Amino acid sequence: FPATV
Amino acid sequence: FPATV
Amino acid sequence: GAMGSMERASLIQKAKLAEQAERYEDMAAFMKGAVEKGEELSCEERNLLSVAYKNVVGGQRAAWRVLSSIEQKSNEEGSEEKGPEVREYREKVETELQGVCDTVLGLLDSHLIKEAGDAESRVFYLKMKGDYYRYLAEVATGDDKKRIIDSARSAYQEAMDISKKEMPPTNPIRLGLALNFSVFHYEIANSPEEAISLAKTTFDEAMADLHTLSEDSYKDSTLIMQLLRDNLTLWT
Amino acid sequence: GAMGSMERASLIQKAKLAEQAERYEDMAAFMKGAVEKGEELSCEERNLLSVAYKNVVGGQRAAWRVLSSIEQKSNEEGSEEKGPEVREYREKVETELQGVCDTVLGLLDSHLIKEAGDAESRVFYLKMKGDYYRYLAEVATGDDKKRIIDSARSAYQEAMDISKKEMPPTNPIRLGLALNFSVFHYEIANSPEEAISLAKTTFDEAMADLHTLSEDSYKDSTLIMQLLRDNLTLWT
C-alpha cells in the first residue's frame, strides 16, 4: 500500500 | 520480562 | 456522552497516557469526549484526536483487507464452499469500521469544521474529512459509492484550496494533505496520472521552499517529502 | 450468550479468521461462545481459546505495566502532582484485565476442567488456570493477594503432578507448563531458586528424551527448551 499520514 | 508460552 | 462527567483536561491527560500505553481505542474515546466539551482544539489536541482514530481505523482497515482477500479466494473458480462465515465476519468488521468513520465525521461536522477559522485548524480538519470518507470509499459498493468518493474529493479540494492560499509549500499539514489526496486519486478515483502529477508538483514546490526553514522544520518537511517520493517510486 | 445464536462450527471458523486478521478480542469472544455450547474442546479448539485470551490479556498487561511505571514515577520524591488521572486510568485498565481473567477462569470452572479427563486436556486447562491467576497476582495488592497466589500455585501444582505421571518429559504442554510455573516462582512467589531448579531439571529431563522424537516433535520440544534456557540465562 502507498504511504499516507 | 521472562519467557512464557 | 459517556465521558460527559470527566474534566476536559483529564480527558486530554488520559488520551496522552493511552497513547503511551498503545491503547488507541481508549485514546479515541477520551478525545471524542474532549471534542464533545464544545471548545475548539489546540494544535496538540487536534493531533491527539487524529492519531487516535487513525490508529483505530488503520487496524480495522488491515483486518478488513485480510478478510476481503480470504473472501475473494473463497469465491474463485475451484474453491470449496465455506458457507456464509467469511462474508459475515468481513461484514462485521466493515460495519465497525464504517461506524468509527461516521463517528469521526460526526465530530468534524458537529462542530469542529464550522468553528475552524485559522488555516492550520481548518485544513487539518478538512484533510481528516477527506481521509475518513476515503476509508468509507475503500469498502463502499452500493448506490452511494460515487457519492462517498465525491464527498472525499470535495473535502480534500477545499483543504487544498485553503492550503495553497494560506500556507507555505513546506507546511507539514499541506504536505500530508497532498500526500493523501494523491493516494485518493491513485487508489480511489482511478486517476493515477493525477496522483503522480500532484505528488511531483508538491515535492518540487516544497524543495524550493526548504531554504527558509529551521533545522527542526526542515526535518519535518523532508520526512513527508520522502513519503511523496516513496509513492512516486511505487507508481513509476 | 451473545454468541448463543451462532453455530458452534461457525464460531470456530470465525475464531480462525479473527486470528488471521489479528483481531484477538473477536477471536476470544468467538471461542467463549464455542465453549459455552457445552461440548468438550478438541486440541485445536483448546489452542484457539488459549491463543485468543493470551493475546488479549497480554496487551492489557503491557499497557498496565506502562501505566504503573508512569504512576510510580509520579509518586517519587520530587514529582509534580499530576492529580488522580494516572491512578484512575491504571485502575481502569487493571479492572478490564481482571475482568478478562475472571472470564477465562469462569470458563475453565464452568465446565472445562471438570469434564477434562485426558492428560492433554486436563493439564492444558490447569496450566491456563495457573496462568490467569498469575496475571491476577501481578496486579493484586489487597486482602486477597496471598490467596490469588495460592490459587495459581495450586493449579500449576495439580497440572505438574498429572504431567509427570502421564506425559513424556518432552511433551510441549508439559514443557510450557514448567516454563510458566518457573516464571511464577521467580516473579510472583519470590522463589528464584525454585524457579531456576525447575527450569534446569525440566530442560535436562527433556534433553534426555529427545532421542525418541520425530523431526517435527523435536522442533516443537526444542523450541520450548530454548525458552527455558533463555530464562536461565536471564536469571544466572
Ligand SMILES: N=C(N)c1cc(-c2cccc(NC(=O)C3(Oc4ccccc4)CCOCC3)c2)cs1
Ligand atoms: N502524537 C502526539 N502526542 C502529538 C503530536 C503533535 C504534533 C504537533 C505538530 C504537528 C504534528 N503532526 C502534523 O501536523 C502532521 O503529521 C506530521 C507532521 C510532521 C511530520 C510527519 C507527520 C499531521 C498529519 O498530516 C501531516 C502533518 C503533530 C503534538 S503531540
Ligand SMILES: N=C(N)c1cc(-c2cccc(NC(=O)C3(Oc4ccccc4)CCOCC3)c2)cs1
Ligand atoms: N493457533 C492456532 N490456530 C492453532 C494452534 C494449534 C496447536 C496444536 C498443537 C499444539 C499447540 N501448542 C501447544 O500445545 C503449546 O504451545 C506450543 C507448542 C509447541 C511449541 C511452542 C508452543 C501451548 C502452550 O503451552 C505449550 C504447548 C497448538 C492448532 S491450531
